[PDB]
Amino acid sequence: GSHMATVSVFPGARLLTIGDANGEIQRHAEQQALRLEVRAGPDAAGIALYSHEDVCVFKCSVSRETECSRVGRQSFIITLGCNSVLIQFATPHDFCSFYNILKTCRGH
């Protein structure tokens, strides 16, 4: 307040919000063409995704304790509370860059 963040930006991400309270999988929300911004900090990575109308569709902090995983070649799932969010990157290269930031922040 004020501050200047320098973020890694991954344009053209897809976000799928999911649950499993129906004994299968539920899709709660699904959104394309989001701008993902990642703020690399000491012990956590700040994640936020924005629509072209500046809507902040999802925001969280990923730390060593966060339940999360690579999914396939270019996606990442984060589970906070009862729902999970799956982020699908535009390319495997983008995912790999993102993952390396997260591994650094989480102490791996």
Place this chain on the structure above:
Amino acid sequence: GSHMATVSVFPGARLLTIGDANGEIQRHAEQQALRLEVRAGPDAAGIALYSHEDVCVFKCSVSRETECSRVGRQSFIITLGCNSVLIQFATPHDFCSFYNILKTCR
């Protein structure tokens, strides 16, 4: 032989194969009625899913290194090489029992 060991058994599990090749979740598998068995050691937990006919449809070892995560309140994703599977338990209670057993090796 011989020694004693524990086998933790979770009937009514299911396995979905997550498929990425053109976009959406591509079900290479969507198998109902499996029993998941965990054979846990100090540093890795052996997981195997068996059909009613005792066919092993999926197996792996879970350790500190394994790329995996809780999904929702009763599911678990495991990613190995390029491929991911989603295991779904019969109840959130089953999932929590399973998750707790993995805490040592993870």
